[PDB]
PDB file of all heavy atoms in Angstrom:
ATOM      1  N   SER A   1      86.517 102.566  85.406  1.00  0.00           N
ATOM      2  CA  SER A   1      86.231 101.828  86.607  1.00  0.00           C
ATOM      3  C   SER A   1      85.016 100.886  86.287  1.00  0.00           C
ATOM      4  O   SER A   1      83.984 101.329  86.472  1.00  0.00           O
ATOM      5  CB  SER A   1      85.793 102.794  87.721  1.00  0.00           C
ATOM      6  OG  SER A   1      86.857 103.822  87.862  1.00  0.00           O
ATOM      7  N   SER A   2      85.359  99.677  85.964  1.00  0.00           N
ATOM      8  CA  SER A   2      84.405  98.601  85.758  1.00  0.00           C
ATOM      9  C   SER A   2      83.570  98.296  87.044  1.00  0.00           C
ATOM     10  O   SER A   2      84.157  98.125  88.070  1.00  0.00           O
ATOM     11  CB  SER A   2      85.175  97.388  85.282  1.00  0.00           C
ATOM     12  OG  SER A   2      84.364  96.225  85.044  1.00  0.00           O
ATOM     13  N   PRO A   3      82.231  98.215  86.957  1.00  0.00           N
ATOM     14  CA  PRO A   3      81.537  97.975  88.234  1.00  0.00           C
ATOM     15  C   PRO A   3      81.999  96.745  88.999  1.00  0.00           C
ATOM     16  O   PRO A   3      82.210  95.695  88.452  1.00  0.00           O
ATOM     17  CB  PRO A   3      80.036  97.837  87.772  1.00  0.00           C
ATOM     18  CG  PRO A   3      79.981  98.656  86.515  1.00  0.00           C
ATOM     19  CD  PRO A   3      81.420  98.390  85.800  1.00  0.00           C
ATOM     20  N   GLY A   4      82.200  96.960  90.349  1.00  0.00           N
ATOM     21  CA  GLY A   4      82.667  95.882  91.160  1.00  0.00           C
ATOM     22  C   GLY A   4      84.046  95.472  90.973  1.00  0.00           C
ATOM     23  O   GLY A   4      84.482  94.517  91.685  1.00  0.00           O
ATOM     24  N   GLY A   5      84.824  96.102  90.093  1.00  0.00           N
ATOM     25  CA  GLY A   5      86.103  95.586  89.625  1.00  0.00           C
ATOM     26  C   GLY A   5      87.266  95.990  90.357  1.00  0.00           C
ATOM     27  O   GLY A   5      87.187  96.644  91.518  1.00  0.00           O
ATOM     28  N   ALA A   6      88.463  95.725  89.871  1.00  0.00           N
ATOM     29  CA  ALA A   6      89.742  95.938  90.582  1.00  0.00           C
ATOM     30  C   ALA A   6      90.013  97.468  90.717  1.00  0.00           C
ATOM     31  O   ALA A   6      90.472  97.869  91.818  1.00  0.00           O
ATOM     32  CB  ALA A   6      90.869  95.280  89.805  1.00  0.00           C
ATOM     33  N   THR A   7      89.829  98.182  89.760  1.00  0.00           N
ATOM     34  CA  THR A   7      90.196  99.674  89.679  1.00  0.00           C
ATOM     35  C   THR A   7      89.324 100.367  90.808  1.00  0.00           C
ATOM     36  O   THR A   7      89.909 101.143  91.588  1.00  0.00           O
ATOM     37  CB  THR A   7      90.015 100.226  88.351  1.00  0.00           C
ATOM     38  OG1 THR A   7      90.875  99.462  87.486  1.00  0.00           O
ATOM     39  CG2 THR A   7      90.321 101.654  88.274  1.00  0.00           C
ATOM     40  N   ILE A   8      87.938 100.203  90.811  1.00  0.00           N
ATOM     41  CA  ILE A   8      87.201 100.844  91.803  1.00  0.00           C
ATOM     42  C   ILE A   8      87.533 100.492  93.150  1.00  0.00           C
ATOM     43  O   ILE A   8      87.434 101.181  94.135  1.00  0.00           O
ATOM     44  CB  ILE A   8      85.699 100.682  91.455  1.00  0.00           C
ATOM     45  CG1 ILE A   8      84.831 101.666  92.297  1.00  0.00           C
ATOM     46  CG2 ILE A   8      85.209  99.210  91.587  1.00  0.00           C
ATOM     47  CD1 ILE A   8      85.135 103.144  92.107  1.00  0.00           C
ATOM     48  N   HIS A   9      87.976  99.194  93.413  1.00  0.00           N
ATOM     49  CA  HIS A   9      88.385  98.704  94.791  1.00  0.00           C
ATOM     50  C   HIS A   9      89.667  99.577  95.152  1.00  0.00           C
ATOM     51  O   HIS A   9      89.798  99.971  96.292  1.00  0.00           O
ATOM     52  CB  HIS A   9      88.614  97.266  94.915  1.00  0.00           C
ATOM     53  CG  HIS A   9      87.376  96.502  95.120  1.00  0.00           C
ATOM     54  ND1 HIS A   9      86.361  96.448  94.135  1.00  0.00           N
ATOM     55  CD2 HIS A   9      86.974  95.771  96.125  1.00  0.00           C
ATOM     56  CE1 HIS A   9      85.368  95.670  94.640  1.00  0.00           C
ATOM     57  NE2 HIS A   9      85.671  95.338  95.886  1.00  0.00           N
ATOM     58  N   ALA A  10      90.631  99.784  94.186  1.00  0.00           N
ATOM     59  CA  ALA A  10      91.810 100.581  94.503  1.00  0.00           C
ATOM     60  C   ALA A  10      91.555 101.998  94.782  1.00  0.00           C
ATOM     61  O   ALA A  10      92.099 102.635  95.581  1.00  0.00           O
ATOM     62  CB  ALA A  10      92.822 100.351  93.405  1.00  0.00           C
ATOM     63  N   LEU A  11      90.663 102.569  93.872  1.00  0.00           N
ATOM     64  CA  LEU A  11      90.239 104.003  94.111  1.00  0.00           C
ATOM     65  C   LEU A  11      89.723 104.144  95.506  1.00  0.00           C
ATOM     66  O   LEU A  11      89.922 105.110  96.172  1.00  0.00           O
ATOM     67  CB  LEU A  11      89.205 104.450  93.152  1.00  0.00           C
ATOM     68  CG  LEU A  11      89.699 104.420  91.681  1.00  0.00           C
ATOM     69  CD1 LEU A  11      88.680 104.781  90.610  1.00  0.00           C
ATOM     70  CD2 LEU A  11      90.843 105.523  91.604  1.00  0.00           C
ATOM     71  N   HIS A  12      88.893 103.203  96.011  1.00  0.00           N
ATOM     72  CA  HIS A  12      88.340 103.330  97.387  1.00  0.00           C
ATOM     73  C   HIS A  12      89.456 103.508  98.397  1.00  0.00           C
ATOM     74  O   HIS A  12      89.436 104.288  99.262  1.00  0.00           O
ATOM     75  CB  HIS A  12      87.391 102.283  97.762  1.00  0.00           C
ATOM     76  CG  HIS A  12      86.665 102.385  98.983  1.00  0.00           C
ATOM     77  ND1 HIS A  12      85.843 101.407  99.556  1.00  0.00           N
ATOM     78  CD2 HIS A  12      86.502 103.507  99.863  1.00  0.00           C
ATOM     79  CE1 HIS A  12      85.410 101.832 100.749  1.00  0.00           C
ATOM     80  NE2 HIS A  12      85.718 103.170 100.934  1.00  0.00           N
ATOM     81  N   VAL A  13      90.476 102.573  98.319  1.00  0.00           N
ATOM     82  CA  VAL A  13      91.495 102.677  99.368  1.00  0.00           C
ATOM     83  C   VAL A  13      92.295 104.023  99.188  1.00  0.00           C
ATOM     84  O   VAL A  13      92.795 104.604 100.213  1.00  0.00           O
ATOM     85  CB  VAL A  13      92.478 101.421  99.407  1.00  0.00           C
ATOM     86  CG1 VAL A  13      91.644 100.154  99.448  1.00  0.00           C
ATOM     87  CG2 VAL A  13      93.457 101.458  98.239  1.00  0.00           C
ATOM     88  N   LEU A  14      92.450 104.501  97.944  1.00  0.00           N
ATOM     89  CA  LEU A  14      93.036 105.920  97.915  1.00  0.00           C
ATOM     90  C   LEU A  14      92.108 106.937  98.652  1.00  0.00           C
ATOM     91  O   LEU A  14      92.644 107.826  99.359  1.00  0.00           O
ATOM     92  CB  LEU A  14      93.274 106.272  96.386  1.00  0.00           C
ATOM     93  CG  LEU A  14      94.297 105.460  95.559  1.00  0.00           C
ATOM     94  CD1 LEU A  14      94.280 106.038  94.119  1.00  0.00           C
ATOM     95  CD2 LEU A  14      95.718 105.773  96.159  1.00  0.00           C
ATOM     96  N   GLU A  15      90.878 106.916  98.323  1.00  0.00           N
ATOM     97  CA  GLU A  15      89.991 107.835  99.050  1.00  0.00           C
ATOM     98  C   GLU A  15      89.967 107.655 100.530  1.00  0.00           C
ATOM     99  O   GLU A  15      89.865 108.662 101.259  1.00  0.00           O
ATOM    100  CB  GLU A  15      88.463 107.631  98.564  1.00  0.00           C
ATOM    101  CG  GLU A  15      88.312 107.874  97.026  1.00  0.00           C
ATOM    102  CD  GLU A  15      88.405 109.360  96.672  1.00  0.00           C
ATOM    103  OE1 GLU A  15      88.571 110.250  97.541  1.00  0.00           O
ATOM    104  OE2 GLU A  15      88.208 109.702  95.373  1.00  0.00           O
ATOM    105  N   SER A  16      90.161 106.469 101.028  1.00  0.00           N
ATOM    106  CA  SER A  16      90.047 106.245 102.468  1.00  0.00           C
ATOM    107  C   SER A  16      91.291 106.906 103.169  1.00  0.00           C
ATOM    108  O   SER A  16      91.329 107.137 104.382  1.00  0.00           O
ATOM    109  CB  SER A  16      89.969 104.730 102.920  1.00  0.00           C
ATOM    110  OG  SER A  16      88.686 104.258 102.418  1.00  0.00           O
ATOM    111  N   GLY A  17      92.441 107.061 102.395  1.00  0.00           N
ATOM    112  CA  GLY A  17      93.566 107.696 102.918  1.00  0.00           C
ATOM    113  C   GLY A  17      93.559 109.210 102.711  1.00  0.00           C
ATOM    114  O   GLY A  17      94.569 109.929 103.172  1.00  0.00           O
ATOM    115  N   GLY A  18      92.489 109.791 102.147  1.00  0.00           N
ATOM    116  CA  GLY A  18      92.571 111.228 101.810  1.00  0.00           C
ATOM    117  C   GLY A  18      93.490 111.649 100.799  1.00  0.00           C
ATOM    118  O   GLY A  18      94.073 112.669 100.716  1.00  0.00           O
ATOM    119  N   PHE A  19      93.785 110.652  99.807  1.00  0.00           N
ATOM    120  CA  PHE A  19      94.758 110.801  98.792  1.00  0.00           C
ATOM    121  C   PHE A  19      94.603 112.238  98.081  1.00  0.00           C
ATOM    122  O   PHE A  19      95.548 112.948  97.917  1.00  0.00           O
ATOM    123  CB  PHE A  19      94.482 109.783  97.657  1.00  0.00           C
ATOM    124  CG  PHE A  19      95.322 109.828  96.455  1.00  0.00           C
ATOM    125  CD1 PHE A  19      96.658 109.515  96.463  1.00  0.00           C
ATOM    126  CD2 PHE A  19      94.783 110.065  95.154  1.00  0.00           C
ATOM    127  CE1 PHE A  19      97.545 109.568  95.373  1.00  0.00           C
ATOM    128  CE2 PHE A  19      95.651 110.042  93.998  1.00  0.00           C
ATOM    129  CZ  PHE A  19      96.921 109.843  94.118  1.00  0.00           C
ATOM    130  N   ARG A  20      93.314 112.601  97.709  1.00  0.00           N
ATOM    131  CA  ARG A  20      93.123 113.932  97.140  1.00  0.00           C
ATOM    132  C   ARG A  20      93.589 115.096  98.047  1.00  0.00           C
ATOM    133  O   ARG A  20      94.247 115.945  97.513  1.00  0.00           O
ATOM    134  CB  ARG A  20      91.557 114.121  96.784  1.00  0.00           C
ATOM    135  CG  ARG A  20      91.047 113.175  95.647  1.00  0.00           C
ATOM    136  CD  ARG A  20      89.491 113.202  95.754  1.00  0.00           C
ATOM    137  NE  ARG A  20      88.993 112.374  94.690  1.00  0.00           N
ATOM    138  CZ  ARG A  20      88.704 112.659  93.453  1.00  0.00           C
ATOM    139  NH1 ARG A  20      88.811 114.037  93.106  1.00  0.00           N
ATOM    140  NH2 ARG A  20      88.248 111.900  92.586  1.00  0.00           N
ATOM    141  N   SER A  21      93.187 115.043  99.285  1.00  0.00           N
ATOM    142  CA  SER A  21      93.577 116.104 100.211  1.00  0.00           C
ATOM    143  C   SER A  21      95.098 116.263 100.260  1.00  0.00           C
ATOM    144  O   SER A  21      95.614 117.386 100.528  1.00  0.00           O
ATOM    145  CB  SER A  21      92.993 115.881 101.540  1.00  0.00           C
ATOM    146  OG  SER A  21      93.569 114.864 102.297  1.00  0.00           O
ATOM    147  N   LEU A  22      95.911 115.111 100.160  1.00  0.00           N
ATOM    148  CA  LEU A  22      97.308 115.288 100.236  1.00  0.00           C
ATOM    149  C   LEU A  22      97.937 116.073  99.140  1.00  0.00           C
ATOM    150  O   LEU A  22      98.800 116.864  99.390  1.00  0.00           O
ATOM    151  CB  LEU A  22      98.005 113.889 100.349  1.00  0.00           C
ATOM    152  CG  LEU A  22      97.498 112.993 101.522  1.00  0.00           C
ATOM    153  CD1 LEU A  22      98.335 111.649 101.557  1.00  0.00           C
ATOM    154  CD2 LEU A  22      97.547 113.628 102.897  1.00  0.00           C
ATOM    155  N   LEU A  23      97.477 115.777  97.870  1.00  0.00           N
ATOM    156  CA  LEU A  23      97.900 116.629  96.739  1.00  0.00           C
ATOM    157  C   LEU A  23      97.457 118.118  96.865  1.00  0.00           C
ATOM    158  O   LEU A  23      98.270 118.939  96.479  1.00  0.00           O
ATOM    159  CB  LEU A  23      97.276 115.907  95.470  1.00  0.00           C
ATOM    160  CG  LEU A  23      98.005 114.585  95.219  1.00  0.00           C
ATOM    161  CD1 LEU A  23      97.149 113.609  94.268  1.00  0.00           C
ATOM    162  CD2 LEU A  23      99.434 114.794  94.685  1.00  0.00           C
ATOM    163  N   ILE A  24      96.234 118.300  97.298  1.00  0.00           N
ATOM    164  CA  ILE A  24      95.876 119.748  97.671  1.00  0.00           C
ATOM    165  C   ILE A  24      96.798 120.267  98.660  1.00  0.00           C
ATOM    166  O   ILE A  24      97.393 121.452  98.466  1.00  0.00           O
ATOM    167  CB  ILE A  24      94.447 119.845  98.093  1.00  0.00           C
ATOM    168  CG1 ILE A  24      93.501 119.224  96.959  1.00  0.00           C
ATOM    169  CG2 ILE A  24      94.070 121.162  98.479  1.00  0.00           C
ATOM    170  CD1 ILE A  24      91.988 119.062  97.546  1.00  0.00           C
TER     171      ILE A  24
END
């Protein structure tokens, strides 16, 4: 995750959906 970059922006939208909680 490069600072300010594309990947960290995409991780944020996964987090905002509760991505982790769905797999749990």
Side-chain angles (χ1 to χ4, degrees):
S1 312
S2 179
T7 299
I8 189 63
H9 278 65
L11 294 175
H12 188 191
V13 308
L14 291 175
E15 299 287 1
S16 293
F19 179 71
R20 290 164 180 273
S21 75
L22 303 185
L23 291 156
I24 300 170

